[PDB]
Design a protein around this ligand. Structure first.
Ligand SMILES: CCNC(=O)CCNC(=O)[C@H](O)C(C)(C)COP(=O)(O)OP(=O)(O)OC[C@H]1O[C@@H](n2cnc3c(N)ncnc32)[C@H](O)[C@@H]1OP(=O)(O)O
Ligand SMILES: C[C@H]1O[C@@H](n2cnc3c(N)ncnc32)[C@H](O)[C@@H]1O
Ligand code: MET
Ligand code: SF4
Lengths: 538, 677
């Protein structure tokens, strides 16, 4: 059998490389791959997955630095895990049989198993289908699969899929959340609070969750509810900056409610990511440019997280027939490239882009662009125009090194501030300006005069979030060279505290945190109060 | 005059919910929703149940019998800060003691038969532990202790060698062990073990001669073994303890470090000692269990300083037999695996039959017309069929389908055909595949755990639509001609062969609750959630003009109806509702109140020549009382042993005594009564 022959080649490679390691000899993996394949009469190269699949642990301890696959999965600095909710119905349908004019198949839209705004062919979708949407099974399977690639899971985070979450029966969501927390804790519980207390002392060190929603479920009741879950960031879906479009799109709400939702959430202390929807009906190209410029020029919005999704006519929706009637037309691909290139030149430095384009399978869209890759095309176009972008994701150390191999040389501090939703926002960072490469960031502001949480009443400044990018470093490990444990955060904390004490003129500092991360602040003398970590300022 | 016949269930999911009595013919004990179950492996029959604790039972614990005889005492710790002792006798209970003081759920228990003032230690979820003296009826909490934070997870008691001095080792979540000695009548923190770095997932003593070895199934994916003894070489940790003015010195140090698993190690069990015809050997067989479906029975050798592993055949625990020939474990969920060693080869093992259940909760069931097999459906998104087995003991034989969404409706069609209702707007129709039919007819003229799910699938023949929302009820007529179904505000009726609409009724305002085909196929009763009922009369596909109905006032019940049933000759119908009201119908009887919320009601298929109609009523608190009302009365009710702990769901009867008890405790109990009674 050939299979045992490849196995023998694998063992040969293993012994050669461990021998090289013992004396510290350096060898090209591909070279020995080729030589072993030739000397054993192999017609095809060996897969690296199987190469990792046989190392003994007393060597996996140190061989991973030369064995990890697709390092970009940790090139940010934090592991990411996605989970799927049970399919259900959106609330608005209470009026008529309208989900959204552009939304894909929902619970009952000619799909055996699917979800609202999801065809059902995403790898996450098949994972959920096999898992029968069970949280625990799918999360264990996914984390195991990720660890197969020899990646540290010291710090992890959770993102939840699904159409709508706030609009679900409470007992179900509590069951779901406690199952998630028990997945990392390994301790069977009975309520949310028990799972919280147990996960406090776990070692997986969860650092937060983010959920999608819509402005209807944005009153302070739901915010307090989410405070009990440790959620950090939120998704809304804006789709426009013009009220008329909403009723044109049958969205079923007002942009105003979105604006007050933004203001209230920012006052509370969460983070928010918006969704932008270019090339819409009754929208000219100049309309798109103007509205996108407005999206940052207005102090009303000035959001933090940005996501973009170009229009995609798909069978089943009303827009399918509208285009089919030859009345809704898209742009040429060059037009889209120019649009994106212009947009990227406009992003303020603090904002971070997370994704571009949808992940829908190709042979389904009546106007789907050929290119699965668009950011690269935009990059080519903006090289052609000789104008650069300043997105966070494009100036962190991880991506910049993995795509250009540039080493920071002189890192310094930088401070900026602006106004948004009435807030006195403030942004701090360490970064190297000459290469414009960034390492660490912090977002801190003064709380608004009107608030929902009385714990913030008077002399209180909230620090929304703090983060240093890079790659995962185990909490016990100190220096694999790199930049994740040099004490950088300490300086930012002390300086932010000093600013709040003097410039803010407050009297007590509060902060949101992940369930595990609380212990970190304990090292600085921060004590708990409700769901908020806090320190007295006098 | 009611006697239990068969019970089907599964243990809970949390760790440490199974145990064996250490005496010969060791009985098997495991927890459930709120009760406890005693079961034997000899004839593979549940011994009995204990309907005690009122929460998710967390951890059970047998009692040590130093003489080497079957145990008769038990310790249970449940989910609401309640720990119960149990005095077993002749397969029954004498009395139970309900210790109080804990706040959070209790998950660590250990009791020692002192050498009676038995000793109890129990750590609850409130970062605290308590110590209790039990001398006969006298019970008290000897001591209470707590930590700064975190929790303890590992608890096991011990005596100092060659004396009665008691000593405890506790494993908290702080990656180290703590020890306590009861000198001066009080347990004193003596030492700590700074071993591996993870949560402690279990500790086990083993008295080997003069010395005492220790096992630690750690979460750190490692195993470390120390040993206590009496007082170039390393630095061992020793101390002196007071004992009748004698400072006896004891020394402990590491013995070995074993590592053969990948995921977390959950449970370890020493080989229990037993008699070689009065010969008390001290074996060193050890058992291990981990997450990654791996059994390793470690063992040393004549010179094996590092213990030698053995057959790795193979989910939080694996229990071990007295002699060691048997061995058992539970799956991650639902079923469980049972292996036995074979004499021919020391490396030989064979799986063995074990009972199971829906392990979450059952919502519907059915009686086959022939009377040899019953089909049930639960919230586990499964379906199961049960039939008696010969050699008589009933056993689950098939799992016809597994469904993505939950299933909550069921109806019968023909000899192998049925229809189920789920969380969708669809109706599915199943018929038995041939292979299953021949395999069944062979048995009637022993499926294993894993072969079942591989080869118990069924085909689908139909797919029905029409309801604007998820289905909520389903039923079929006796003559097998039409069926009734309703979602959460219309009625849709389907022909059998055509599978198409026959007539649609939109009469009620709120959600439908239950249907009832008239036994003589002359009417169709409908009870809904709007405190009203409807009756529709078939004409000479005859239409179903409303023969009679009720308004908001003519209705007798003041709250939501739940159940309805006809008369054997369709003379009268009977309704039960949450307002604990019982009525007979026009109405011809007084309110037959019972003081408990009505969840289910059913009638005898045949009537006595005395015309004394009898009725079975399933209440909301697990109690099952029965009454009788001839045209113008309590007869017998269920025992404490024969009572559920949750609301009843359906009470169907045998037809050609016996009936069905489909509780919410994910248990299927069958009860027989005297034919004459
Ligand atoms: C709030 C939820 N979001 C996140 O947590 C984002 C991910 N967080 C991180 O990657 C890191 O915590 C940071 C972004 C703060 C970078 O770490 P930073 O360089 O600032 O830490 P410092 O160098 O200033 O201090 C080092 C100490 O932090 C400790 N530490 C690292 N991670 C954690 C953690 N989750 N919880 C508690 N302590 C931690 C280290 O053990 C180290 O202690 P040591 O004295 O034994 O070395
Ligand atoms: C997730 C974000 O993408 C939008 N969205 C969801 N599905 C589609 C689609 N087929 N086409 C365009 N936008 C879509 C949502 O309305 C939300 O704004
Ligand atoms: C997945 S669509 C975006 C989130 C949410 N369904 C909304 O429209 O508000
Ligand atoms: S609210 Fe969002 S998920 Fe729901 S139908 Fe509209 S676009 Fe789709």
């Amino acid at each position: 059998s050939p299979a045992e022959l490849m196995m023998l080649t694998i063992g040969d490679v293993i012994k050669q490389l461990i021998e090289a390691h013992e004396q510290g000899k350096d060898i090209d993996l591909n070279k020995v791959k080729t030589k072993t394949a030739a000397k054993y009469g192999l017609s095809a190269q060996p897969r690296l997955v199987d190469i990792i699949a046989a190392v003994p642990p007393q060597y996996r301890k140190v061989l991973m630095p030369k064995l990890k696959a697709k390092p970009i999965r940790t090139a940010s600095g934090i592991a990411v895990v996605a989970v799927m909710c049970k399919p259900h119905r959106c609330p608005h349908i209470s009026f008529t049989g309208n989900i959204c004019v552009y939304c894909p198949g929902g619970p009952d839209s000619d799909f055996e198993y699917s979800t609202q705004s999801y065809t059902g062919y995403e790898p996450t979708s098949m994972r959920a289908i096999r898992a029968r949407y069970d949280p625990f099974l799918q999360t264990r399977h996914r984390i195991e699969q990720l660890k197969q690639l020899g990646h540290s899971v010291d710090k992890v985070e959770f993102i939840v899929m699904g159409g709508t979450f706030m609009a679900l029966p409470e007992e179900y969501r509590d069951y779901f959340i406690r199952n998630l927390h028990d997945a990392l804790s390994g301790h069977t519980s009975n309520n949310i609070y028990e799972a919280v207390k147990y996960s406090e002392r776990s070692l997986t060190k969860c650092i937060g969750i983010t959920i999608e929603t819509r402005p209807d479920y944005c009153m302070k009741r739901h915010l307090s509810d989410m405070l009990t879950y440790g959620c950090t960031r939120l998704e809304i879906g804006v789709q426009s900056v013009y009220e008329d479009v909403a009723r044109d799109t049958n969205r079923g709400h007002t942009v105003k409610a979105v604006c007050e939702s933004f203001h209230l959430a920012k006052d509370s202390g969460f983070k928010v990511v918006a969704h932008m929807m270019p090339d819409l009906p009754n929208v000219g190209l100049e309309r798109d440019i103007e509205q996108f410029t407005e999206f940052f020029e207005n102090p009303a919005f000035r959001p933090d997280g940005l996501k973009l999704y170009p229009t995609l006519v798909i069978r089943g929706t009303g827009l399918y027939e509208l285009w089919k009637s030859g009345r809704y037309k898209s742009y040429s691909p060059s037009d889209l490239v120019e649009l994106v290139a212009r947009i990227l030149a406009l992003v303020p430095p603090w904002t971070r882009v997370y994704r571009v384009q949808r992940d829908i399978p190709m042979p389904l869209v009546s106007s789907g662009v050929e290119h699965g890759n668009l950011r690269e095309l935009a990059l080519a176009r903006m090289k052609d125009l000789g104008i650069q972008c300043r997105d966070v994701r494009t100036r962190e150390v991880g991506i910049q090194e993995i795509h250009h191999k540039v080493r920071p040389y002189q890192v310094e501090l930088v401070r900026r501030d602006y106004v948004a939703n009435g807030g006195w926002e403030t942004f701090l960072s360490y970064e190297d300006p000459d290469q414009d490469i960034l390492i660490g960031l912090l977002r801190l502001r003064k709380c608004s005069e009107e608030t929902f949480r009385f714990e913030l009443g008077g002399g209180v400044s909230i620090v929304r979030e703090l983060h240093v990018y890079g790659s995962v470093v185990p909490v016990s490990s100190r220096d694999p060279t790199k930049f994740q444990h040099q004490g950088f955060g300490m300086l930012l904390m002390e300086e932010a505290e000093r600013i709040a004490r003097e410039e803010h003129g407050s009297g007590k500092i509060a902060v949101i945190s992940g369930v595990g991360t609380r212990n970190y602040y304990r090292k600085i003398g921060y004590r708990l109060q409700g769901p908020y970590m806090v320190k007295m300022l006098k | 005059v009611l006697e239990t016949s068969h019970v089907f269930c599964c243990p809970n999911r949390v760790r440490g919910v199974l145990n064996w009595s250490s005496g010969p013919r060791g009985l098997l004990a495991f927890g459930t929703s709120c009760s406890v179950v005693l079961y034997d492996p000899l004839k593979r029959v549940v011994v009995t149940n204990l309907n005690g604790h009122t929460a998710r039972v967390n951890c059970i614990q047998w009692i040590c019998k130093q003489d080497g005889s079957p145990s008769t005492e038990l310790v249970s710790g449940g989910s609401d800060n309640q720990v119960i002792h149990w005095e077993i006798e002749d397969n029954q209970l004498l009395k139970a003691v309900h210790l109080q003081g804990h706040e959070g759920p209790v998950y660590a228990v250990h009791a020692v038969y002192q050498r009676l003032c038995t000793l109890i230690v129990s750590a609850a979820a409130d970062s605290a532990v308590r110590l209790w003296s039990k001398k006969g009826p006298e019970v008290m909490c000897l001591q209470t202790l707590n930590f700064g934070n975190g929790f303890a997870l590992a608890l096991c008691l011990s005596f100092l060698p060659n004396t009665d001095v008691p000593i405890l080792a506790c494993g908290n979540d702080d990656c180290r062990i703590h020890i306590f000695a009861q000198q001066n009548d009080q347990f004193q923190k003596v030492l700590s073990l700074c071993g591996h770095e993870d949560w402690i997932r279990g500790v086990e003593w083993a008295a080997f001669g003069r010395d005492l070895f220790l096992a630690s199934c750690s979460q750190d994916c490692l195993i470390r073994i120390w040993k206590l003894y009496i007082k170039i070489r390393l630095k061992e940790n020793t101390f002196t303890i007071e004992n009748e003015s004698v400072k006896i010195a004891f020394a402990v140090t590491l013995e070995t470090v074993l590592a053969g698993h990948e995921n977390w190690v959950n449970a370890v069990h020493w080989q229990p000692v037993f008699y070689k015809d009065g010969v008390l050997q001290q074996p060193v067989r050890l058992l291990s269990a981990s997450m990654d479906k791996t059994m390793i029975l470690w063992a040393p050798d004549e010179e094996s300083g590092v213990w030698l592993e053995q057959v790795r055949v193979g989910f939080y625990d694996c229990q071990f037999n007295e002699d060691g020939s048997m061995i058992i474990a539970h799956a991650f969920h639902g079923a469980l695996h049972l292996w036995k060693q074979n004499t021919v080869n020391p490396r030989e093992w064979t799986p063995e039959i074990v009972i199971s259940g829906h392990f979450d909760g059952v919502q519907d069931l059915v009686w086959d017309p022939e009377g040899e097999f019953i089909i049930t459906v639960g919230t586990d998104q499964t379906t199961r069929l049960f039939a008696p087995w010969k050699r008589v003991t009933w056993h689950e034989i098939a799992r016809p389908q597994i469904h993505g969404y939950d299933l909550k409706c069921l109806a019968m069609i023909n000899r192998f055909q049925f229809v189920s209702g789920a969380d969708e707007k669809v109706l599915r129709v199943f018929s038995a595949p041939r292979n299953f039919v021949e395999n069944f007819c062979a048995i009637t003229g022993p499926p294993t755990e894993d072969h079942l799910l591989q080869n118990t699938l069924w085909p689908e023949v139909q797919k029905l639509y029409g309801h604007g929302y998820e289905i909520f009820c389903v039923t079929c007529n006796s003559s097998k001609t039409l069926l009734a179904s309703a979602c959460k505000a219309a009625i849709i009726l389907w022909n059998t062969t055509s599978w198409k609409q026959v007539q649609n009724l939109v009469f009620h305002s709120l959600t439908v609750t239950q249907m009832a085909f008239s036994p003589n196929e002359k009417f169709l009763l409908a009870v809904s959630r709007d405190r009203t009922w409807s009756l529709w009369k078939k004409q000479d596909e005859p239409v179903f003009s409303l023969f009679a109905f009720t308004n908001k006032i003519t209705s007798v019940h003041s709250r939501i109806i739940w159940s309805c049933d006809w008369s054997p000759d369709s003379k009268y119908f009977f309704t039960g509702s949450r307002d604990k009201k019982v009525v007979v119908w026009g109405p011809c009887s007084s309110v037959l109140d019972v003081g408990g919320a009505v969840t289910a009601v059913s009638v005898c298929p045949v009537l006595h020549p005395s015309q004394r109609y009898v009725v079975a009523v399933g209440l909301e608190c697990g109690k099952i009382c029965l009454y009788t009302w001839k045209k113008t009365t309590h007869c017998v009710e269920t025992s404490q042993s024969q009572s559920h702990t949750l609301a009843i769901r359906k009470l169907c009867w045998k037809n050609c005594l016996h009936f069905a008890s489909c509780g919410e405790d994910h248990t299927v109990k069958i009860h027989r009564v005297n034919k004459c009674a």
